[PDB]
Design a protein around this ligand. Structure first.
Ligand SMILES: [Cl-]
Ligand SMILES: [Cl-]
Ligand SMILES: [Cl-]
Ligand SMILES: [Cl-]
Lengths: 443, 443
């Protein structure tokens, strides 16, 4: 009573950050659930109010095109106006914010990364919510430093990585992917002052506690308990990392090559960025009815492809027609991450390797889905090149933790073959292309 | 050839590190499995061989004492004559060799940490095999570097860290927690240069492949499937961390306090040390027969305490007489770590907390054992102050990965009150006491 509580005056500012890291993690966990439950409302009101008479296929294709384009145009007009920095994932806009390179305007991003991400991702576009939640989370961590008035220089990098950790923890119910997002992915940007790593923990805890009360689901991806991977067959997860580790730098040259190729029909205009974003967001709404595996930001193709429900000629067709629809969305300037459309390209090429590995090897008794869970985090290690948070996020979402060894081998063969090929991390190459564009345009 | 020529000009010395880290990682899967199969064959040769108790009880308590003390005076003697750095855990001898301070004498530690870790830890003493596998692993990472005569200090800090991560991946069968030993626990010593981390990833998976070849994996601790905790009850995991976070600085105050206190009964001699080691390590083979939860490394009673086969008049006798046999065994110069004795120390105080919360709160319908898994990584976060190497290492040996939010909450409140109530990490306070005692030797 009177022998313990007098030590608060000794370290009053560390206990001022760790209390504020509890209100960062609470406010990010509310803004992430209202994102995910608010984007599922616009996705259920779209397909639910699509079929009306069930025999009017000319009008039903028109409604599926316009009602997903106007929602997408609401997410493209609110981005190039009033908040131009919320025009992509948001992981490069916080990686250049832990180091003092990019400004953090929470008064502009938070009514835009929320209300534009609800119209972009709610239009059936191939874009995930790992983008608009870590960017929202990185700005709520900046928001409480202007509400609670503190001008600390170490309390502004601590809370901005707290809500960024709380954004990944409250988007995928993944408390371990949120902490290791700051540790090993954002390694040259984090400080680790022994109180900042405790403040990341409170923000991750309070954002996953607020995921309990409104999301009573067991997993985000509903693939059950798959088979084990014996260590007679752990060399096929090294050939899987070789195949994924070569496509990774080729995909990063395709992301950054389509950001400049699509930036030629409009050239930077406002009346032509929006009309192009409605032609993209309407095409991914028109694809939501005629081919539901092509459109969408993953997470429904993922527990279907890993069960062997697709054929071989249809898994090749999806990988061609999902690369086209994920380079037309993320490499266009829409608020939405490339993360969840990379989880849907990992279970397609992973199963296409897993369906061939049971024809050449009948003596291994291989399941065709164990290469889809392992391949899911193998494009996150070759493109983004954050292999450890990309294999404690496939495990946190599919709950298939028995593949903890084969998912490292395909996460290590992907990182090793992406560095040998000549590939950069994707979230550090979008940031390095926006800083060099900022320096060369104002001069 | 074409590709063969261009892989030798630019990246040859980075590829020589990634090939050495596969030879380093393989050799801590053959010297780490045969260490665990040597302490388990010696365990079933002194307590499984002398099993007939129906004939002579006074002629068996001496055999349970003499056969476990003669093994104890082989390791208390090999350390004190041939490799004095091999005594104790061995993580502070790698934590203090990763930067510049202590040498890595693989020509002295490896015949002593092996055949003394077989003698003490396999001869019935309360010691964990994490310690004698990090130091054997880190010395192998220097041994292969010295045999192949690699040139540079960039590979010396690299390959010593791959072997210390190869040790944790095969002593406990955890590929994911071995990398977080180097990333999270070895934070201010390890150098991250984008090739050394892939040498750790190579050295870990080459040390877990060589586990399942010999030791066919299912789980170390055989708790089957505990109940998924309803996260209404997550505030009880914070008071579990508060209770452990107070005891944590009190516990390692006894660890360093008993190393100094036991240093007066023998002085610094080599006859009085093994005669102390023949009684302080000798009664734990006698306590391993009349009360087998009071002695031993502390892994047999973890499935017994978590399942709830104890009362709270026996859950105190295996905590009062379990801290005594842990401070006597580890903190007296015996070649054996303290991870597994403070793992059995967390699941006993966690079950005592678990058996109380099911009486005061019948509305929650709690299990008394879900706090035992959450309390296992609590003393590893309060004393060692490495939560993510404690709350991920016990998920991989118990195979209950649904308690992550109950364990990050317990791992936070353990770390938060071990910093407030001033407690340094155990392996950073053991090393800083051996650094100050070697600077007083030169004068
Ligand atoms: Cl972008
Ligand atoms: Cl989505
Ligand atoms: Cl020691
Ligand atoms: Cl042990």
């Amino acid at each position: 009573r009177q022998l313990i509580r007098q030590l608060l005056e000794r370290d009053k500012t560390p206990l001022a950050i760790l209390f504020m890291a509890a209100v960062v993690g609470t406010l990010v966990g509310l803004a992430a659930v209202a994102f995910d439950k608010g984007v599922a409302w616009l996705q259920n009101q779209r397909m639910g109010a699509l079929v009306h008479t069930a025999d009017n296929y000319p009008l039903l294709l028109t409604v599926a095109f316009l009602a997903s384009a106007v929602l997408a145009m609401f997410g493209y007009f609110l981005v190039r106006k009033y908040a131009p920095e919320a025009g992509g994932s948001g992981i490069p806009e916080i990686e250049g914010a832990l180091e003092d390179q990019r400004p953090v305007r929470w008064w502009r991003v938070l009514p835009v990364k929320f209300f534009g991400g609800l119209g972009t991702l709610g239009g059936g576009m191939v874009l995930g919510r790992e983008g608009p939640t870590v960017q929202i989370g990185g700005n709520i961590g900046r928001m409480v430093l202007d509400i609670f008035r503190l001008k600390g220089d170490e309390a502004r990098h601590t809370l901005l990585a707290t809500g960024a950790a709380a954004g990944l923890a409250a988007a995928f119910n993944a408390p371990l992917a949120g902490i290791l997002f700051i540790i090993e992915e954002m390694r040259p940007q984090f400080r680790y002052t022994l109180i900042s790593i405790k403040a990341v923990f409170i923000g991750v805890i309070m954002s996953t506690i607020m995921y309990c009360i409104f999301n009573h689901e067991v997993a985000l991806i509903d693939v059950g308990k798959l088979s084990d991977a014996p260590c007679n067959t752990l060399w096929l997860y090294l050939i899987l990392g070789i195949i994924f580790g070569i496509f990774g730098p080729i995909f990063n040259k395709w992301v950054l090559g389509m950001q400049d190729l699509l930036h030629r029909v409009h050239g930077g205009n406002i009346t032509k960025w929006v009309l192009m974003g409605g032609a993209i967001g309407g095409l991914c709404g028109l694809l939501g009815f005629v081919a539901p595996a092509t459109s969408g930001g993953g997470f429904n193709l993922i527990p279907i492809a890993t069960a062997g429900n697709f054929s071989m000629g249809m898994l090749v067709f999806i990988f061609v027609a999902r690369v086209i629809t994920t380079l037309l969305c993320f490499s266009s300037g829409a608020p939405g991450g490339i993360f969840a459309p990379m989880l849907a390209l990992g279970t397609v090429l992973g199963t296409a390797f897993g369906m061939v590995a049971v024809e050449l090897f009948p003596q291994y008794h291989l399941e065709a889905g164990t290469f889809a869970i392992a391949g899911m985090g193998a494009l996150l290690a070759a493109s983004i090149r954050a292999p450890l948070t990309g294999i404690i996020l496939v495990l946190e979402m599919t709950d298939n933790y028995q593949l903890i060894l084969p998912m490292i081998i395909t996460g290590l063969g992907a990182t090793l073959l992406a560095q040998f090929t000549g590939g950069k991390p994707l979230y550090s190459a979008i940031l390095a292309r926006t800083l060099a564009k900022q320096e060369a345009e104002q001069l």
